[PDB]
């Protein structure tokens, strides 16, 4: 058995005792930190400090029982280990609560704010610690049984799979769904929208009207240009077609490539550019076009809608994957995919929307697309959550591998040499309770401010203490 002196367990338990106390006091005393995320972080600091306190308290009790020299050891063992088990389940729940808090505050920011009042968050955190303590007591009673060890190992692989999903989305696929703020900016334009729109419509020789725009690839079962081309055919026979201007861009297959220019010729008010324009001119098009139509059959990332919403274009897209999660009711119009008749109704509905001042609608699109920036506070909380789970996974990894060996290869000589280093895995677990306060401070500017007001009072609650 790997030996480390009992001084370490008591010391590490005290460091986290002071750190996580400072975390809870700071979040409570600061009115700006009364958000649901910091309330789940507050409970995470509670479960973190109870673990390191219980491990330090257990070491003192262990060092006392072997010296004074029974059957009372088993009872205090069943209670100390019950606090560790209940806090571990709460530590997993507090991390998943932040994950749920980050998923909803990113996509459905306002609907989550109304339902997650200051009262309802206290009920959930209370219910989490209720089911965790009840499950913690039953886990320790049947700690040698199979269902308990299979359950805890499963919970670690769940946190491991969620961490792998977060590293793939945030870091690997960073440039896949990340909006570019330095490029998709209205500052690169000049004038008003109708001023730029008349210049664009005169550049193609057209009367001023409601300008719809499609950009993408001409394919038969992917981007959905066939849905839009038949939507123009349906709208062709109507009377409201004369107030519309369509600009379709994208090269694909000659069957649809020729159909686009077939409608461009038989209608005049339709412009078809079978070339791949530079990103600088597509930026200029979004700042002038009234509505951007994205009739995609499959769009995993809403980046195509975010790029147009930054420059004030109002998207008319399908409720498919990424376009579904980005576009709400106030910042666009959604329709069923593959339906050309329903898309024509959205184009007719968008024509009626143009009769009022869309300056607020475009200001909602700019605001909605502005929150998905990598340097924004919304996506920054997801990276803070990825650090919190990646830290918890690494610190608890050797323990759960020892838990796997306990049930899969206890007699194996190689698994025995690993399980004998268990006292190292306890120290690593206690380091999760010390590193976590360092993560909240490093990734929260408001928490460092209230940290300085306490480190200055810790120097001020000492002059009045000695005089």
């Amino acid at each position: 058995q790997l030996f480390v002196s009992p001084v370490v367990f008591v010391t590490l338990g005290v460091i986290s005792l002071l750190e996580n106390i400072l975390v809870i006091v700071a979040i409570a005393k600061n009115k700006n930190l009364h958000s649901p995320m910091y309330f789940f972080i507050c409970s995470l600091a509670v479960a973190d400090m109870l673990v390191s306190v219980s491990l330090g308290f257990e070491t003192i009790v262990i060092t006392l029982l072997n010296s004074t020299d029974q059957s009372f050891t088993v009872n205090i063992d069943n209670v100390i280990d019950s606090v560790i088990c209940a806090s571990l389940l709460a530590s997993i729940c507090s991390l998943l609560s932040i994950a749920v808090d980050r998923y909803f505050t990113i996509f459905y920011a306002l609907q989550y704010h109304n339902i997650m009042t200051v009262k309802r968050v206290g009920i959930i955190i209370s219910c989490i610690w209720a089911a965790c303590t009840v499950s913690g007591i039953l886990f320790i009673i049947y700690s040698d049984s199979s269902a308990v060890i299979i359950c805890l190992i499963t919970m670690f692989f769940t946190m491991l799979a969620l961490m792998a999903s977060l590293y793939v989305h945030m870091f690997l696929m960073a440039r896949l769904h990340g909006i570019d703020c330095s490029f998709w900016n209205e500052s690169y334009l000049t004038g008003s929208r109708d001023e730029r729109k008349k210049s664009l419509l005169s550049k193609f020789g057209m009367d001023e009207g409601v300008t719809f725009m499609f950009i993408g690839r001409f394919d038969r079962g992917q981007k959905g240009v066939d849905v839009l081309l038949k939507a123009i055919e349906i709208l062709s026979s109507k009377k409201e077609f004369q107030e519309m201007r369509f600009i379709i861009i994208g090269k694909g297959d000659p069957e649809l490539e020729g159909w686009a220019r077939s409608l461009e010729e038989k209608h005049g008010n339709v412009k078809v550019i079978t070339e791949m324009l530079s990103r600088e001119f597509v930026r200029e098009l979004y700042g002038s076009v009234d509505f951007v139509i994205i009739p995609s059959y499959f769009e995993p990332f809403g980046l195509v809608a975010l790029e147009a919403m930054c420059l004030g274009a109002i998207p008319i897209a399908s409720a498919v994957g990424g376009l579904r999660d980005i576009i709400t009711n106030e910042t666009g119009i959604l329709v069923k995919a593959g339906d050309p008749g329903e898309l024509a109704n959205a184009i007719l509905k968008a024509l009626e929307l143009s009769r009022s001042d869309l300056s607020k609608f475009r200001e909602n699109c700019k605001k909605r697309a502005m929150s998905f920036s990598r340097q924004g506070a919304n996506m920054k909380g997801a990276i803070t959550l990825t650090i919190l789970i990646g830290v918890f996974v690494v610190c608890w990894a050797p323990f759960f591998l020892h838990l796997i060996f306990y049930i899969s290869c206890p007699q194996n000589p190689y698994c025995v040499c690993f399980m004998s280093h268990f006292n190292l895995y306890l120290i690593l677990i206690m380091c999760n309770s010390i590193i976590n306060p360092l993560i909240y401070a490093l990734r929260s500017q408001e928490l460092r401010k209230t940290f300085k007001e306490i480190i200055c009072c810790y120097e001020f609650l000492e002059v009045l203490f000695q005089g």
């Binding site: 367990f9 491990l55 257990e58 070491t59 009790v61 262990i62 029982l65 050891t73 088993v74 205090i76 063992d77 280990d81 560790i84 320790i140 700690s143 060890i149 323990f399 020892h402 838990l403 306990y406 268990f422 006292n423 306890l426």
Partner: peptide, 8 residues
């Protein structure tokens, strides 16, 4: 009475 559980 071991440090933590799953020790004996």
């Amino acid at each position: 009475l071991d440090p933590x559980r799953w020790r004996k």
